[PDB]
Amino acid sequence: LQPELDS
Amino acid sequence: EGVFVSNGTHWFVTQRNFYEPQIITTDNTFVSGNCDVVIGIVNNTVYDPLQPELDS
Amino acid sequence: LQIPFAMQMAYRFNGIGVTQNVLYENQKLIANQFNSAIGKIQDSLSSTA
Ligand SMILES: *[C@@H]1O[C@H](CO)[C@@H](O[C@@H]2O[C@H](CO)[C@@H](O)[C@H](O)[C@H]2NC(C)=O)[C@H](O)[C@H]1NC(C)=O
Numbered sequence: 001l002q003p004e005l006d007s
Numbered sequence: 008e009g010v011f012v013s014n015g016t017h018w019f020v021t022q023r024n025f026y027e028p029q030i031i032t033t034d035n036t037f038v039s040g041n042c043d044v045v046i047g048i049v050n051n052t053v054y055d056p057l058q059p060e061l062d063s
Numbered sequence: 064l065q066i067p068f069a070m071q072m073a074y075r076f077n078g079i080g081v082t083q084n085v086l087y088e089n090q091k092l093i094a095n096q097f098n099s100a101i102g103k104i105q106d107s108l109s110s111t112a
């Protein structure tokens with residue numbers, strides 16, 4: 001999740 | 008769990024023993040390998056439910 | 064209810080706790096093993112009354 005929520 | 012199924016214009020995933028169409032999604036499918044391997048594989052756009060939530 | 068035979072075997076594999084992609088990624092090999100096994104049964108009956 002967080003590797004996308006780095007947005 | 009289901010089979011991929013098509014009414015001719017669209018693709019859905021559906022449980023074996025009673026017809027119910029659902030939009031093909033990362034949360035009703037799983038990934039293995041790549042497209043070169045499988046016999047009779049077809050092209051379609053699999054939905055991702057996280058994608059509209061990229062505000063943060 | 065009709066079903067494509069390779070997809071039937073994917074459910075037979077899934078019923079023994081092997082993930083269904085293992086058939087499709089090996090379908091050629093699995094078919095050659097099955098056809099060869101049938102050949103040996105024909106030889107057994109052709110020899111061993
Ligand atoms: C295949 O199923 C889809 C979904 O039920 C059908 O597409 C819908 O068609 C209606 C009009 O009949 C539209 O108002 C919807 O917006 C369409 N939905 C989608 C997801 O595009 C499609 O018509 C069906 N095709 C056949 C041949 O049955």
Ligand SMILES: *[C@@H]1O[C@H](CO)[C@@H](O[C@@H]2O[C@H](CO)[C@@H](O)[C@H](O)[C@H]2NC(C)=O)[C@H](O)[C@H]1NC(C)=O
Pocket residue numbers: 048049050
């Ligand atoms: C599925 O889509 C792929 C593209 O993602 C199609 O592959 C292309 O097909 C043309 C025509 O044969 C080739 O010239 C290209 O080099 C292919 N591109 C790639 C990236 O492979 C493919 O034809 C489609 N397959 C089906 C069965 O519809």
Ligand SMILES: *[C@@H]1O[C@H](CO)[C@@H](O)[C@H](O)[C@H]1NC(C)=O
Pocket residue numbers: 046047
């Ligand atoms: C299905 O059979 C047709 C001929 O009846 C053939 O053209 C097609 O390539 C076959 N597709 C698959 C997925 O076996």
